[PDB]
Structure formats: C-alpha cells, structure tokens
Design an enzyme around this catalytic site. Structure first.
Site, PDB file in Angstrom:
ATOM      1  N   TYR A 112      12.457   4.827   4.349  1.00  9.40           N
ATOM      2  CA  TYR A 112      12.794   4.239   5.426  1.00  9.40           C
ATOM      3  C   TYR A 112      11.994   2.839   5.714  1.00  9.40           C
ATOM      4  CZ  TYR A 112      15.283   8.437   6.144  1.00  9.40           C
ATOM      5  OH  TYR A 112      16.192   9.624   5.912  1.00  9.40           O
ATOM      6  N   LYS A 170       4.264  -2.340   8.574  1.00 13.85           N
ATOM      7  CA  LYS A 170       5.157  -1.432   8.335  1.00 13.85           C
ATOM      8  C   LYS A 170       6.472  -2.236   8.532  1.00 13.85           C
ATOM      9  CE  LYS A 170       7.024   2.913   9.103  1.00 13.85           C
ATOM     10  NZ  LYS A 170       7.238   4.135  10.246  1.00 13.85           N
ATOM     11  N   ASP A 195       7.500  15.788  10.447  1.00 12.75           N
ATOM     12  CA  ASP A 195       7.335  15.661   9.174  1.00 12.75           C
ATOM     13  C   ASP A 195       5.884  15.379   8.916  1.00 12.75           C
ATOM     14  OD1 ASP A 195       8.361  14.469   6.709  1.00 12.75           O
ATOM     15  OD2 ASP A 195       8.112  12.568   7.354  1.00 12.75           O
ATOM     16  N   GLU A 231       8.867  -0.106   3.682  1.00  9.99           N
ATOM     17  CA  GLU A 231       7.810  -0.520   2.957  1.00  9.99           C
ATOM     18  C   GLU A 231       6.649  -0.825   3.862  1.00  9.99           C
ATOM     19  OE1 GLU A 231       8.934  -3.824  -0.008  1.00  9.99           O
ATOM     20  OE2 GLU A 231      10.871  -2.836  -0.219  1.00  9.99           O
ATOM     21  N   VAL A 232       5.426  -0.917   2.959  1.00  6.38           N
ATOM     22  CA  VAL A 232       4.204  -0.672   3.781  1.00  6.38           C
ATOM     23  C   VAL A 232       3.159  -1.648   3.115  1.00  6.38           C
ATOM     24  CG1 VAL A 232       2.292   0.536   4.861  1.00  6.38           C
ATOM     25  CG2 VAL A 232       4.519   1.480   5.116  1.00  6.38           C
ATOM     26  N   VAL A 261       0.846  -1.127  -0.184  1.00  2.00           N
ATOM     27  CA  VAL A 261      -0.063   0.140  -0.145  1.00  2.00           C
ATOM     28  C   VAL A 261       0.885   1.227  -0.007  1.00  2.00           C
ATOM     29  CG1 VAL A 261      -2.092  -1.025   0.978  1.00  2.00           C
ATOM     30  CG2 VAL A 261      -0.215  -0.171   2.378  1.00  2.00           C
ATOM     31  N   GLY A 262       1.992   1.149   0.180  1.00  2.00           N
ATOM     32  CA  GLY A 262       3.033   2.429   0.137  1.00  2.00           C
ATOM     33  C   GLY A 262       4.357   1.941   0.246  1.00  2.00           C
ATOM     34  N   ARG A 263       5.449   3.164   0.160  1.00  2.00           N
ATOM     35  CA  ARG A 263       6.689   2.714   0.243  1.00  2.00           C
ATOM     36  C   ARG A 263       7.530   4.147   0.434  1.00  2.00           C
ATOM     37  NH1 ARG A 263      10.198  -1.315  -3.681  1.00  2.00           N
ATOM     38  NH2 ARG A 263      12.015  -1.413  -2.083  1.00  2.00           N
ATOM     39  N   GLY A 264       8.666   4.074   1.168  1.00  2.00           N
ATOM     40  CA  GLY A 264       9.461   5.439   1.385  1.00  2.00           C
ATOM     41  C   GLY A 264      10.697   5.160   1.597  1.00  2.00           C
TER      42      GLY A 264
HETATM   43  S1  LIG Z   1       3.789   4.438   3.208  1.00  2.00           S
HETATM   44  C1  LIG Z   1       2.615   4.076   4.439  1.00  2.00           C
HETATM   45  N1  LIG Z   1       1.117   3.920   3.665  1.00  2.00           N
HETATM   46  C2  LIG Z   1       0.204   3.661   4.658  1.00  2.00           C
HETATM   47  C3  LIG Z   1      -0.866   3.638   4.642  1.00  2.00           C
HETATM   48 BR1  LIG Z   1      -2.012   3.466   2.908  1.00  2.00          BR
HETATM   49  C4  LIG Z   1      -1.772   3.539   5.842  1.00  2.00           C
HETATM   50 BR2  LIG Z   1      -3.546   2.926   5.742  1.00  2.00          BR
HETATM   51  C5  LIG Z   1      -1.144   3.434   7.139  1.00  2.00           C
HETATM   52 BR3  LIG Z   1      -2.329   3.170   8.508  1.00  2.00          BR
HETATM   53  C6  LIG Z   1       0.174   3.541   7.258  1.00  2.00           C
HETATM   54 BR4  LIG Z   1       0.720   3.623   9.107  1.00  2.00          BR
HETATM   55  C7  LIG Z   1       0.794   3.570   5.930  1.00  2.00           C
HETATM   56  N2  LIG Z   1       2.013   4.023   5.650  1.00  2.00           N
END
Ligand SMILES: S=c1[nH]c2c(Br)c(Br)c(Br)c(Br)c2[nH]1
EC number: 2.7.11.1
Length: 325
Positions: A44, A62, A150, A46-47, A39-42
């Site tokens: 520091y 996370k 941040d 991966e999520v 669902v995401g990345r950065g």
């Molecule tokens: S990157 C990242 N993306 C993300 C999402 Br989409 C949710 Br719902 C949540 Br709860 C968190 Br902690 C993160 N970190």
C-alpha cells in the site's frame, strides 16, 4: 463477543474522535520534504528517508499507492488520535503531489535495523525490553479505542543503538466499537489470530495480543515465522499442530462457530505440542520458564482468555525491565 477492557472508549468520546469519515484533511507543503533514499516498500505504500528543508532535520516520507478516500482518512485520524502516546510513530505532516494528488505521510525519522539482521543479535534482556516497549504502544492504543490489526516485526521500528522503539504502519488499524462486526481480512498471514481464520467478526484488541505472541514466539525460539502457513487454511493447520485440536473444539463451540468442511478436514486431529519442544542449541539461551509462561498466556485460541496489554506488562517476565524504570 465484547472486549474485557476499554469497551466504552469510543462510546464516551465525542463523534469527532472516532468518526474518521468526517475528517477534512488540512494539507501541508510538499516542497518542505525532499526524498533522500528508499528504505522500504509494501502493498500500500513506498517509503523513503527524507529531509525537512526548513530545519535540515531527517524524516520518513511514506508515499501512498492509490488509496480510497475512506481508508486514508482512517489511517490519518488514528495517527492524529495516537500522536504523542508511548512508542507510537509520530505523524509530522500530511502532503500531496499537486498534479496527481498522491498523498504522502511524513513521520519522525527512526534509524531502524532490519529484524532479520537485528533479532539474532538480541540478548535475553533486549528481547524482554523491546517487547515491553511494544506492550506500551499496544496498551496505549487499546486505551484510546484503537486495534492495530497488523502487529509484526516489519511494523516495529528499532534503533538498537539508542534503544528506541516505534510501532508503525497503522494502515490496517481500526476504532473498536462494542459488538461491531469487523472484516477478518486484516493482519499478515503468520500473525492472524484464530478469530480471523474461523470467521469470528466480533473480535477486539485481543487480536493484537495473538499477533504479539507469534512475534514473541519467533524471537525466543529463533524460528520466524513461528506459524508458517502457506495460506489461510494452512495457517490454522499450523496453529492446530501446536495448540492441539481439543482447545480448538471447545473454542469453536463456545462462540457457535461452524468450520468449513474443507477446512475442518484440512485441520484434522492433533494433540498439543508443549512449548519446550521448540527448544534447541540455537535458542536455549532465550527460553526460560517465564518466557514460556508469558508466551503461553498470549497464544490462546480464545481471544477473551489472552492477557491484555496491561496484564502482560506486569508479568514477572518483564520484572527486571520494570525495575530499571
Ligand atoms: S516500509 C517502512 N519502512 C519504514 C522505516 Br525503515 C521507518 Br524508519 C519508518 Br519511521 C517507517 Br514509518 C517505515 N515504513
């Protein structure tokens, strides 16, 4: 420079509270939590969207990229300290891959809608409401002695359908201590306050209020990021081309700040651009005298002159939001 509020929080509290280096992590079970989808990345972490195999309940996994023991304890201690306060992401468990020792943080699930997709659909009222919800997170954490450091849309999770807001990513957050000199290499470029750009190390909660202001300015003006600098020196040039150089000049002399001749030359000399100069047909419906007045009291060079998260919540701008409670 000290904080105008909550300066004695970590002072009156036991060393247990703020001393994150003395944390001994009680690791959970890595099998309890299965990855469903990314669902995401950065930089520091991966999520992933996850599942708790015990209760079939959704969660957020996370997975952290190789992090120093010092930094990870900082994130955890803060998360545990703030777990339960208004619109703070709830840390559910802390686990690790047995073989490699890579830590994962398990969070409550939030069905988030990307701000690039979500924000253009937000009405005048929704904006007021969600900033107010963010303000609750900020005053809460500030009240507990934490600066987020941040604040940006990417760290604000929003389920539009259920109208729930969570402030996430406390990877840069830190305990405020009176007159402690801090690293200015925090936040993300477009939301860095002038204190970080001019090397003022003794900053405070006020930093998050600038960041908040850039975020807010982008939402009402429909221009994200609002201050679009290519690098740290250009970031300040962009601010100076708005707030004007004179206000910068008085700010720098008050704190005895000397700018780099490279930077001072880059900044140049500019008059103030009134906020109403950012109004157009794409944004006319979100800009108001109240929106402008609120924005105006947040986006100040002088960190001591900005509204505190508590002050900000009482602004007539947020009045109708308050009445609905
Ligand atoms: S990157 C990242 N993306 C993300 C999402 Br989409 C949710 Br719902 C949540 Br709860 C968190 Br902690 C993160 N970190």
């Amino acid at each position: 420079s000290k904080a105008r509020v909550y300066a004695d929080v970590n002072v009156l509290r036991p060393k247990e509270y703020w001393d994150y280096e003395a944390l001994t992590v009680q690791w959970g079970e890595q099998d309890d939590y299965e990855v469903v989808r990314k669902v995401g990345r950065g930089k520091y972490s991966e999520v992933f969207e996850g599942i708790n195999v015990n209760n079939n309940e959704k969660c957020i996994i996370k997975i952290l990229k190789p992090v120093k023991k010092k930094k990870i304890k900082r994130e955890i201690k803060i998360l545990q300290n703030l777990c339960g306060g208004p619109n703070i992401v709830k840390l559910l468990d802390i686990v690790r891959d047995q073989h490699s020792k890579t830590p994962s943080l398990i969070f409550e699930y939030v069905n988030n809608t990307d701000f690039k997709v979500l924000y253009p659909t937000l009405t005048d009222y929704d904006i007021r409401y969600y900033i107010y919800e963010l303000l609750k997170a900020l005053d809460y954490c500030h009240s507990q002695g934490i600066m987020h450091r941040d604040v940006k849309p990417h760290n604000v999770m929003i389920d539009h359908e259920l109208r729930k807001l969570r402030l996430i990513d406390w990877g840069l957050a830190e305990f405020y201590h009176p007159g402690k000199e801090y690293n200015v290499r925090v936040a993300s470029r477009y939301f860095k306050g002038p204190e970080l750009l001019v090397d003022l190390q003794d900053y405070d909660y006020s930093l998050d209020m600038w960041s908040l202001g850039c975020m807010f300015a982008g939402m009402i003006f429909r221009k994200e990021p609002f201050f679009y600098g290519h690098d740290n020196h250009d970031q300040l040039v962009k601010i100076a081309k708005v707030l004007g150089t004179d206000g910068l000049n008085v700010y720098l002399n008050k704190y005895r700040i000397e700018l780099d001749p490279q930077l001072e030359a880059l900044v140049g000399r500019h008059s103030r651009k009134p906020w109403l100069k950012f109004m157009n047909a794409d944004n006319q419906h979100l800009v108001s005298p109240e929106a402008i007045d609120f924005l105006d009291k947040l986006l100040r060079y002088d960190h001591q002159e900005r509204l505190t998260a508590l002050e900000a919540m009482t602004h007539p701008y947020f009045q109708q939001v308050r009445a609905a409670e």
